[PDB]
Amino acid sequence: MQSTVHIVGDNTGWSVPSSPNFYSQWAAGKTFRVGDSLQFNFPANAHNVHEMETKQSFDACNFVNSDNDVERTSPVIERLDELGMHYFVCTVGTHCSNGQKLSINVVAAN
Amino acid sequence: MQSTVHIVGDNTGWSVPSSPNFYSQWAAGKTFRVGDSLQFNFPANAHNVHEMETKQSFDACNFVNSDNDVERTSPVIERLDELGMHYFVCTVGTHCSNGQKLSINVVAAN
Ligand SMILES: [Cu+2]
Ligand SMILES: [Cu+2]
């Protein structure tokens, strides 16, 4: 049994959405298990993908512990290695405040 | 411009090859740039993917600084983040000595 590579936002990919609830509706339709990966597809240089530690920072789009940026190449494929809540955002400009952020709950595979 | 996700061994995937030179011929037909990723597809639980630090360890299949194992889920997708030589092996049994190892040279994207 192969693990799944989920395509964030399906055909829409990773961008600033028209409705702020876009990625949380997308995540609620899937089940994510340890071993799966998340693929973020976007036009190079326009966005990025950063994982945040805590819900508070994710909620506030506060990137003080975030990494200066650097890599904006796509696709970015992140492995889901640990159980529990994971938070990813785009740190460009106001994109996170405009809804380009995704929180998912990872469960075991067995 | 999207980065490439290369499929290690193309349709063959990641397994112990019939000829020991299999993965080095596969790697010599491609160009790998920072930002691309390598996807290793194999039957769960049968192999794994581990990156080694030095050529000497890779050459000898010496896994003394290697990580106990743990995750054998597939696919494993590794991002190529740094320039220069990268070495990956399967640490199960005698697979590395039997040719299940891959060394690639990563160049810049610009
Ligand atoms: Cu963005
Ligand atoms: Cu193996």
UniProtKB/Swiss-Prot annotation, chains A, B:
Secretion signal span: none
Domain Phytocyanin: 4-108
Disulphide-bridged cysteine pairs: C61-C96
Keyword Glycoprotein: yes
Binding sites annotated in the UniProt record for Cu cation: H47, C90, H95, Q100
Carbohydrate-modified residues: N110
UniProt KW keywords: Copper, Disulfide bond, Electron transport, Glycoprotein, Hydroxylation, Metal-binding, Pyrrolidone carboxylic acid, Transport
Residues annotated with Pyrrolidone carboxylic acid modification: Q2
GO molecular function term, any single one: metal ion binding
The protein, known as: Cucumber peeling cupredoxin
Part of the whole protein covered: 1 to 109 of 137
